[PDB]
Amino acid sequence: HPAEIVAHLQPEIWNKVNRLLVRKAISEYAHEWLLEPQRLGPGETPGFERFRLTLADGAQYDFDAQVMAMRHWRIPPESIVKTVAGVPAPLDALQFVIEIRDKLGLPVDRLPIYMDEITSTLHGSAYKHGRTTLGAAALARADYQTIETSMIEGHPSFVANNGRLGFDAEDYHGYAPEAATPVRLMWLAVHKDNAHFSCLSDMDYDSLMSEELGESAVTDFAARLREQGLHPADYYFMPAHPWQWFNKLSLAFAPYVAQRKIVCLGYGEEQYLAQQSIRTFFNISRPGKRYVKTSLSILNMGFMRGLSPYYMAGTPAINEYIHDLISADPWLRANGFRILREVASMGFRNYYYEAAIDTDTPYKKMFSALWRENPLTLIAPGQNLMTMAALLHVDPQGRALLPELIQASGLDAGTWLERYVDAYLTPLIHCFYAHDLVFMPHGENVILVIQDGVPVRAFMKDIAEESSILNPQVRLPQAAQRLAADVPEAYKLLTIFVDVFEGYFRHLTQILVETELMPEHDFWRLVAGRIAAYQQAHPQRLDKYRRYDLFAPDMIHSCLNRLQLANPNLPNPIACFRPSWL
């Protein structure tokens, strides 16, 4: 029945998730100064103030808030009360966006798209809150992929973060990460005139295919090419997201299909689960196998999710460089921090789009793939992996995962958080100061290695797209040259201030305070302490600690929601712990 496809859309659960998204919208938009709530007096929850939002058409939102560090608006969702001209009304996230549309500054051309992203985020939220779920306590001790597929929030700062625009109602149940439906990849023969292969210096295409597909499947694919009168030597075998084949490649790449530059070989035998990034897949049929990342022409969280052939060309070289650098560094060796290498890549160039468009465009990015190192092969017996996003997880009953994980560990909050900070933040600090090396260290890019509830180290993924060496003097292999970047002095610490402090820790301390684990100031003292101890241990780079000052009175900050909608100072929470040598 066509109705079953949205059976998760029911009035009561819809109201629940709209209330939660209005809370996030009020909090994040206020943080970015899109909203300026008016203080009414003490709030209806102890330690909170009562705030009001008055809109020009008679809508009024009253709520409780605590303004924490970095202008962070901590709001209890049940405290929010909407009245339209004095009459109480249900919280409606889409109405809220419309009511503040003058303040948002969306182009009238882009507003309906933003609205659809909000609606789709809500529909997913309804599905996620209504599905069979593990509670916080069980999830804290679950296996890697169970944790991965059980995440609810998405990116903690972006309001319209889970749109997946392009997935129809049936696509959702087959391909959305939270649906946890096994997926088989589509395999295609691609002509070498269009497809470019790259890999690590000690790998080749044959060895990759031998590990990934196996000789039997490879043999069959080649024999199927010969059978239809083609030369296997003229082709590589390349995986695609099945949605991408049906929706994009079969149609938009029709001339290549017709000319047999692309030949559809059908579904692989092995099954995968879509990861939180949607277009990346973990193999659930066999152990030790690489993730497969694919081009997927859906709009999610600011971007179409294709994969660039130009980027693919240098991806393995960039990863090899960074891996070697990390492996040769004795501080990093002792810490355990490391990357998951994008070991091989395939880019299919569409010369029609390339001839037509000189500029950067998603149209060039519809058909690429890469293979990423499996982290389970890197850890000790008994250890387990969890997406760092899990530390922010709150289950549909309102129970936080973090205190459960800390309880399970047997350690005090302080000791646990010190271990976490030295596993996650300190290596980022070291990579910055010692190597000018920066990543994108948000919850979906960081995998924590957990030992009896305790983070013992961290893995970073999403390397070649996001990483930079901030020193044009670095000597790189030609293929890896785009890694080198040069950023103004004022913005060098962007990845720590914006991506770690504002993008992740800001949300973490709300959880810490709500669950009574730790006051925000204690957390920031601890963070400052780890930074200062690192700097003390490596005094020879004082020039850099002074020039790029983590203890500056004000921090770099970004307005992520403003940036998405488009296409003052923020005091630094560790400034008061500034060490003497600065």
Ligand X SMILES: Nc1ncnc2c1ncn2[C@@H]1O[C@H](COP(=O)(O)OP(=O)(O)OP(=O)(O)O)[C@@H](O)[C@H]1O
Distance CA 496, CA 438 (A): 9
Tell me the residue type at 492.
K
Tell me the residue type at 537.
A
> Scanning the structure block, which residue is given the tokens 């990357």?
339
Tell me the residue type at 368.
S
Alpha helices (H) in 366-412, listed in sequence order? 401-409
Residue 362 carries which DSSP code?
Answer: G
- Cβ nearer to a copy of itself, comparing 117 with 404: 117
Return the percent helix, strand and coil in the chain, to nearest 5: 45, 20, 35
Q: How far is the CB of 100 from a copy of itself (least distance, A)?
A: 11
Is position 217 an interface residue for a copy of itself (rule: CB under 8 A)?
A: no
Contact pattern from residue 49 through residue 88 relative to a copy of itself, giving x for each residue in contact according to CB under 8 A and a dash for the rest = ----------------------------------------
Q: How far is the CB of 321 from ligand X (least distance, A)?
A: 18
Report what 443 binds from a copy of itself, Mg ion, ligand X, none; CB cut-off 5-8 Å by kind.
ligand X
Binding site for ligand X (CB under 6 A): 154-155, 161, 275-280, 293, 300-301, 305, 389, 440, 442-445, 461-462, 465
Distance CA 308, CA 362 (A): 8
Give the one residue of 36, 78, 219, 246 binding a copy of itself; rule: CB under 8 A: 246
Is position 89 an interface residue for a copy of itself (rule: CB under 8 A)?
A: no
CB 450 within 8 A of CB 386: yes
Among residue numbers 161 through 180, which ones bind a copy of itself (CB under 8 A)? 168-170, 172
Among residue numbers 106 through 145, which ones bind a copy of itself (CB under 8 A)? 108, 111-112, 115-116, 119-120, 122-123, 126
Give the one residue of 264, 376, 411, 434 binding a copy of itself; rule: CB under 8 A: 264
Q: How far is the CB of 505 from Mg ion (least distance, A)?
A: 18
CB atoms within 10 A of CB 83: 13
Give the one residue of 99, 270, 342, 462 binding Mg ion; rule: CB under 5 A: 462
Q: Are strands 291-294 and 368-372 parallel, antiparallel or unpaired?
A: antiparallel
Helix (H, G, I), strand (E, B) or coil at 582: coil
151 Cβ contact partners less than 8 Å away, ≥ 6 residues apart: 177, 178, 276, 387, 389, 390, 393
Alpha helices (H) in 176-249, listed in sequence order? 205-212, 215-227, 242-244
Helix (H, G, I), strand (E, B) or coil at 403: helix
- Cβ nearer to Mg ion, comparing 465 with 514: 465
Binding site for a copy of itself (CB under 8 A): 1-3, 5-6, 9-11, 13-14, 92, 94-95, 98, 101, 108, 111-112, 115-116, 119-120, 122-123, 126, 168-170, 172, 186, 242, 245-247, 250-252, 254-255, 257-260, 263-267, 352-353, 355-357, 359, 361, 363
Binding site for Mg ion (CB under 5 A): 445, 462, 465
